[PDB]
Amino acid sequence: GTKVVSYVSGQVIKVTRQKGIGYGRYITIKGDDGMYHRFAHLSAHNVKQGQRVEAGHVIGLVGDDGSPGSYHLHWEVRDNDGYGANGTVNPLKYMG
Amino acid sequence: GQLGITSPTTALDGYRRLRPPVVANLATVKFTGSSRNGIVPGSKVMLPFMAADAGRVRVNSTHAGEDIAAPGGTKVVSYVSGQVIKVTRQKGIGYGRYITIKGDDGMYHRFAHLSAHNVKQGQRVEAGHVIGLVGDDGSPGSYHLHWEVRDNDGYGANGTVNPLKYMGGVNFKESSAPPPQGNTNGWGYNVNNPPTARVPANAIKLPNGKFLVNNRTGALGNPTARAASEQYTVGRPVNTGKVSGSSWSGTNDYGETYGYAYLANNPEFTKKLAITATRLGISAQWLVDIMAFETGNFKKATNWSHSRTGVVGLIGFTPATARALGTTTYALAKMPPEKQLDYVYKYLSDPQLKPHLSKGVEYVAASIFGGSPLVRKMVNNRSGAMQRGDGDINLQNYLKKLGRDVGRRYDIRSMSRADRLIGSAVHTGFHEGCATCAALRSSGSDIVPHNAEFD
Amino acid sequence: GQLGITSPTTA
Amino acid sequence: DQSRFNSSMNELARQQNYQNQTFLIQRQLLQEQMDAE
Amino acid sequence: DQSRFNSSMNELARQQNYQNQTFLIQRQLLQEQMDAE
Amino acid sequence: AAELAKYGLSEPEDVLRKNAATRRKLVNDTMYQLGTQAEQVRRTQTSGY
Ligand SMILES: [Zn+2]
Ligand SMILES: [Zn+2]
Structure with a gap:
């Protein structure tokens, strides 16, 4: 039930759903810092495709798509809008 | 795939035409011993002999050309693509029967002490071309091949380079045969979740995620390696397996590329294809392959x-099919594949086709190939629809060629009996037409017992 | 760059 | 053109490395023959 | 031109080995002189 | 018509009549340029020893 909040101001690129293993409910935001931020494994979306979100905007709720019973948030930072591991940066090191 | 030397200098009437006498594999020798003459330890040299003759030739542990002792009758094979300059005979001491080829690498290669010639002066020979037979002009009783490499087309020792040292330091591809086709139940690529464990590309893709590298076999992600000769014997030869044509997990994963690069570079297309496959009740792999x-x-x-x-589209839309769907062939060709997936789903949603789609890959292939009457004939007569009597455009060949681009072959009931029976031969040595032998040689492993995989 | 290599098996 | 230049540079570097390795092997063999005498 | 450069490098290696080959004779003569002394 | 145009004689009679000498001259000039380039390549083929 906790709310995922965008830490950077940017434009929401895509709000879709992938059923199965990875990226249950994922929202991608093109931050003003030049890096793409992805929040996956969500329960519901509060933003819209092509919407400009400021810092502190509410994005959505956390989900349990990976491990039922325990809720978590898949957080990933990229320099591109791809879907692979080629271009991924560790979010903790990046925010440090 | 450019057999032989691939150095960055080679980069730049009414009668039946027969294929040139070119082989697909070449012999290579790796010396781990201490028998040293100046060539770097542990290097691989490409001999001008066939790969099947690699074990029957010897390097002979004093002149400007290397002598390779080979049994009488072996064929000399050009390792580089070039133009044959001159094919003559010098009776006496040196260069009994010699053939000179101006290779594309910029160096002239001379093969002397031959028995007969198979090329002609001024003929362009590709890599793997058969040049001639070995001779015994020097020492009668024992056959050998005088092999010499030059930077000029002279006749002297001024400009000679040791063939072994020259071959040690050049970039070459020793095999041009395609890797064997088998089961890839585990050799799958997911763009969202890339595999954690990977092996060098020269490995053999065994079923269920197993592989064979450097005479050692194992599983992906498992550090425990077993000897190839100990586990794979004549009783249980190396079989690449087949993919079942009617069994699947029941769920289609978004981003599953199934070994196809187009699905990897277009994740949106992969997602749409997974949606369509799940909606149709069929495995995404079958539709992807088709x-x-x-x-x-x-x-x-x-x-x-x-x-x-006039056939376009992802599934080959004919003008009649396009008219049935309510559009035209040109419009179907203009639309992107993501949009064409909607029309593929609409065509496959036909009640004369949809109920039978989930029964296997063969039903989907028949529906896409012949349409409703082929599917009805399959339902009424499963064996009759897959007849191999002449035709050459029958459904059997269509199912045979499915999954070729990624190394997948399907084991479909009432169709793969011939493939299983014909391919049940066990090879204990190297054979030119066998792809498994080429894969074994390329992986660095010895020729362990394996099933026959020809083409 | 793009992901993938030319297929070693014949097309 | 950039890819071609990179390939040419890599080929030249590996050729020089192979030549240096061959020279080192020749020197080692020369030393072994010296020790033989 | 690339082939010409490769041939030039090969000739350089050959002449380097040719000069290096004198080392065996020099060592043998040094051993002979040491035995004589 | 296809195997006529394979050689280049499918044009109308007047067009073929007006375009004979110039066509042969162009063929000769192209072959002369090709031979000049071939001679240059062969001449540059010299041994360095
Ligand atoms: Zn996660
Ligand atoms: Zn000889």
């Missing part, structure tokens, strides 16, 4: 002039 074959591996999806009969 569309890839029908479009030449997704390189001709939006081509509206390649087919002279």
